[PDB]
Amino acid sequence: TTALVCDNGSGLVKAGFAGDDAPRAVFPSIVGRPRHQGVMVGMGQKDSYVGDEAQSKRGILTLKYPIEHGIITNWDDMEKIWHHTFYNELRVAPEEHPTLLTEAPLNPKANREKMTQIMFETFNVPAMYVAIQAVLSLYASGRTTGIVLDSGDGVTHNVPIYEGYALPHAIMRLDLAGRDLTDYLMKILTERGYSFVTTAEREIVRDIKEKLCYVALDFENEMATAASSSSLEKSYELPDGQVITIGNERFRCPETLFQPSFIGMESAGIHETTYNSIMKCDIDIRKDLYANNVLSGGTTMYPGIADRMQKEITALAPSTMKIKIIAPPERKYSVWIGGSILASLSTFQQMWISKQEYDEAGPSIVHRKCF
Amino acid sequence: SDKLKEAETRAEFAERSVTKLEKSIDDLEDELYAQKLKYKAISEELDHALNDMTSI
Amino acid sequence: SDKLKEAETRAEFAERSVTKLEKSIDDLEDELYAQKLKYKAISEELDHALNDMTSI
Amino acid sequence: VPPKIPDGERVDFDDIHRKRVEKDLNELQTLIEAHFENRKKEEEELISLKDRIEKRRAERAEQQRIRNEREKERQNR
Numbered sequence: 367t368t369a370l371v372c373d374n375g376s377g378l379v380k381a382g383f384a385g386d387d388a389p390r391a392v393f394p395s396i397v398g399r400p401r402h403q404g405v406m407v408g409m410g411q412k413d414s415y416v417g418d419e420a421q422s423k424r425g426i427l428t429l430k431y432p433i434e435h436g437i438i439t440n441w442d443d444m445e446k447i448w449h450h451t452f453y454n455e456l457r458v459a460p461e462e463h464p465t466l467l468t469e470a471p472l473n474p475k476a477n478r479e480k481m482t483q484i485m486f487e488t489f490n491v492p493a494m495y496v497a498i499q500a501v502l503s504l505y506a507s508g509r510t511t512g513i514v515l516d517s518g519d520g521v522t523h524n525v526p527i528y529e530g531y532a533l534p535h536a537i538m539r540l541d542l543a544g545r546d547l548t549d550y551l552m553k554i555l556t557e558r559g560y561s562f563v564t565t566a567e568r569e570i571v572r573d574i575k576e577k578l579c580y581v582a583l584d585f586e587n588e589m590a591t592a593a594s595s596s597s598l599e600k601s602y603e604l605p606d607g608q609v610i611t612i613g614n615e616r617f618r619c620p621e622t623l624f625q626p627s628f629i630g631m632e633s634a635g636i637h638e639t640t641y642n643s644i645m646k647c648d649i650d651i652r653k654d655l656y657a658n659n660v661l662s663g664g665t666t667m668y669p670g671i672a673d674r675m676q677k678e679i680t681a682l683a684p685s686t687m688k689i690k691i692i693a694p695p696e697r698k699y700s701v702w703i704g705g706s707i708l709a710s711l712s713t714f715q716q717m718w719i720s721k722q723e724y725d726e727a728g729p730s731i732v733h734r735k736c737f
Numbered sequence: 738s739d740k741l742k743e744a745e746t747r748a749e750f751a752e753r754s755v756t757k758l759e760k761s762i763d764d765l766e767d768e769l770y771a772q773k774l775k776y777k778a779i780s781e782e783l784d785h786a787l788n789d790m791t792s793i
Numbered sequence: 794s795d796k797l798k799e800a801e802t803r804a805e806f807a808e809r810s811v812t813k814l815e816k817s818i819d820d821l822e823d824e825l826y827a828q829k830l831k832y833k834a835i836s837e838e839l840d841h842a843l844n845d846m847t848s849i
Numbered sequence: 850v851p852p853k854i855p856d857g858e859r860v861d862f863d864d865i866h867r868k869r870v871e872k873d874l875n876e877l878q879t880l881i882e883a884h885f886e887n888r889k890k891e892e893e894e895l896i897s898l899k900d901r902i903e904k905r906r907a908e909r910a911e912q913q914r915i916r917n918e919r920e921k922e923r924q925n926r
């Protein structure tokens with residue numbers, strides 16, 4: 367039979383059968399209970415709208431993501447999300463399909479063990495396998511080397527790989543991602559008068575960020591230009607009218623990636639953690655990693671980031687090496703495409719964690735040889 | 738009695754006309770607004786295309 | 794007498810209302826057509842662009 | 850110990866052709882076909898239908914003018 371390539375993610379759940387080009391169903395991972403009282407009788411009001419249904423009734427819900435930073439903080443809601451994904455968005459019972467979840471690097475063990483225990487006890491799948499979210503993004507590019515920066519919505523991690531041999535001592539995981547950029551944008555919009563507070567209006571700020579923000583090639587020059595002319599002010603129409611005008615908030619929101627001091631984080635930007643991740647590698651594979659830097663994940667879709675990052679790394683790196691940044695147009699679904707490719711391989715067909723194996727060793731089987 | 742009958746019938750006919758006109762107005766309004774949103778969307782995507790051209 | 798006075802009065806209101814409704818209907822329809830024609834002119838601009846793109 | 854992947858045979862970077870070159874031409878041609886058929890179905894029919902509705906609207910206007918004038922002529926007392 368065919369395998370189910372699910373990809374929990376944090377912000378958008380992407381799923382679909384193995385062997386295709388794009389995920390079949392992509393929908394936000396939010397579960398929102400209603401918060402008001404409700405007076406109409408017999409309206410058929412449910413107790414929790416999940417997935418894309420709660421992005422249409424969000425006016426009277428309190429949306430809450432079940433995955434904070436890679437890790438899962440609310441297991442009941444995550445179980446509800448998985449149940450919805452299997453039964454309503456794909457309509458395939460899990461009793462007859464292997465599953466291939468994905469997990470960020472350096473995550474707590476208990477999260478992974480609970481994930482496999484749920485998949486084997488509640489949904490009762492035949493066999494499931496957990497894979498690191500960066501190796502798949504490297505599969506999708508058709509490479510076999512390269513250092514991949516997978517800046518998702520929950521957590522940004524940077525896994526270097528050479529000739530198929532991952533370097534476990536050079537993984538640099540940073541917890542700045544799309545959600546923190548949304549919060550920072552929502553916080554700097556208040557400088558013009560627009561106040562978004564409700565958890566429903568966070569979605570509106572996210573839409574503003576997606577449609578308007580861009581990464582500046584040079585930050586100081588843009589700050590000077592936006593403060594003199596008015597060629598940058600782009601307007602946007604809220605879900606009820608009252609258009610708003612975003613000035614130099616456009617390139618200040620995604621600039622947080624390269625200067626995490628804006629949101630008070632100490633660490634260095636995504637332009638310098640990649641160079642540090644390279645320098646921890648051996649001295650003989652640094653040229654190949656320099657030449658095959660891969661971008662993935664949703665948050666790396668800002669217009670103009672593949673040039674800013676290249677300029678920064680070229681500034682840091684030695685002058686002789688060639689710096690090349692692979693930015694495929696299908697960046698958002700790169701991890702899932704790689705997952706489909708991996709699940710479609712014949713050599714991989716014996717790596718699944720078969721159910722009888724789980725019955726013999728318990729949930730701690732995932733840390734064992736079947737990784 | 739005769740005047741009453743004629744007046745009532747004229748009234749009822751005009752009333753039903755009123756209701757049907759309102760319904761027609763509503764439907765044409767929905768279609769026109771959908772066209773308006775379509776136009777705004779096409780213009781906005783056109784401008785995005787222009788800015789994409791500016792990029793590259 | 795009360796009945797027929799009422800009926801004629803409300804009928805006159807109905808006639809004036811319905812005529813106002815007809816002016817409204819025509820204005821809305823003509824504006825819709827003008828907007829749709831602007832949209833189709835834009836579509837033929839895009840179609841000339843597509844004929845250029847026939848370069849591919 | 851870290852997992853040990855059993856040794857296989859092949860391949861990689863050879864499916865990039867079979868997943869890229871396909872849509873490099875088929876997708877472009879199919880989208881061009883879709884745009885052509887949608888424009889043909891939509892624009893000309895919409896303009897013709899709007900002209901037809903405009904003519905019907907003008908006829909309704911004439912009927913309204915005639916009826917209004919005759920009723921005002923009779924009722925004027």
Ligand SMILES: Nc1ncnc2c1ncn2[C@@H]1O[C@H](COP(=O)(O)OP(=O)(O)O)[C@@H](O)[C@H]1O
Pocket residue numbers: 374375376377378379517518519520544545548572575576577663664665667668698
């Ligand atoms: N076109 C875009 N431009 C800018 N940011 C985007 C765009 N699309 C998605 N994002 C950001 O990326 C996030 C989605 O990232 P995603 O790759 O789905 O995360 P995950 O790894 O959990 O799947 C969204 O929250 C949004 O903030």
Ligand SMILES: [Mg+2]
Pocket residue numbers: 375376499516518519663664701
């Ligand atoms: Mg991801």
